[PDB]
């Protein structure tokens, strides 16, 4: 049934680029939805055991980025329903 396992990265183009340049400042990230995340993962990626529940932009921009990224890749497989 999944006849088209074609592309996934078109969602990574499709979800980061639509969420980088709109900053919409006075929220947690003064930058965009993704720029507040890629800067806030490189501080923790080099085997840092920290990141508690008070680490806001790691957990919050973890879930809010995965929930639109999941939705846009699922809708990308819906992008092989019109065939």
């Amino acid at each position: 049934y999944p006849l088209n396992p074609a592309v996934i990265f078109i969602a990574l183009i499709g979800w980061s680029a639509v969420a980088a340049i709109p900053s919409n400042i006075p929220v947690l990230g003064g930058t965009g939805l993704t720029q507040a995340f890629l800067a806030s993962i490189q501080r923790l990626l080099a085997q840092y055991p920290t990141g508690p529940k008070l680490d806001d932009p790691f957990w919050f921009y973890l879930i809010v980025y995965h929930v639109g990224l999941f939705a846009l890749l699922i809708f990308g497989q819906i992008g092989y329903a019109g065939y």
Partner: peptide, 17 residues
């Protein structure tokens, strides 16, 4: 539950603007 309750603490300044 403690994490999302902590998000609800941080609503009215950050997200509920």
């Amino acid at each position: 539950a403690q994490w999302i309750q902590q998000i609800h603490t941080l609503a009215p300044g950050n997200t509920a603007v």
